[PDB]
From a paper:
Here we identified a novel transcription factor [name], which is involved in the regulation of [name] swarming motility and biofilm formation. No discernible motifs were found in both proteins, but bioinformatics analysis suggested that [name], comprising 114 amino acid residues, possesses a potential xenobiotic response element (XRE)-type DNA-binding domain at its N-terminus. Cumulatively, these results indicate that [name] positively regulates the transcriptional expression of the small RNA rsmZ by specifically binding to the promoter region of rsmZ. Further structural analyses suggest [name] functions as a homodimer, which uses positively charged helix to fit the major groove of the dsDNA for binding.
Numbering used by the authors:
A (entry chain A), B (entry chain A): 1 to 101
């Protein structure tokens, strides 16, 4: 998991390294430590843990695995769209892919 | 890594389990085997390997880690957009996020 994305997702949610750490079942005393290893990428969270982080952070798992800065930003935006707006988006994108390019 | 996404990305690119397997430096005799384990999720490709798969498959790493079917489909579409169209997209999305919802 990309540390930057994990850190960026923790800041947006307003969680301290310890808070996020405990929100996923970590031991208090080492919570903030375990998290730092992840955000430093010194440690890699397995799929199970990744799903927990995404749910808590309220961000798509894909975001935490999106190295492309532009795309990631888009992945968070499209996700924050309401069902009604999400429909308008796809409609517009399809139209463009149809002009094609 | 989500198997379905890995398999779906291999089919779209037109690669056989062995081809994809070797395209990332695997031993011929076990290439197709190693890949099946990944697509079955019986084996998890580390970040390094994930980057190799994404590059070869020509799909954003995020896609291979996008459990939400709707989003994934969108992640592939937006990625297939030309720089000129990619600008139009963001412009439209921003406008919507501004109506806000």
């Amino acid at each position: 998991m990309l540390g930057t994305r994990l850190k960026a997702a923790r800041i947006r949610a307003g969680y301290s390294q310890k808070q996020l750490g405990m929100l996923v079942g970590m031991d208090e005393f080492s919570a903030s430590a375990r998290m730092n290893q992840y955000e430093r990428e010194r440690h890699s969270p397995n799929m199970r843990t990744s799903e927990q982080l995404a749910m808590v952070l309220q961000v798509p798992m894909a975001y935490l695995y999106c190295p492309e800065d532009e795309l990631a930003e888009l992945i968070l935006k499209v996700s924050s769209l309401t069902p009604e707006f999400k429909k308008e988006l796809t409609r517009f994108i399809e139209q463009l892919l149809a002009a094609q390019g």
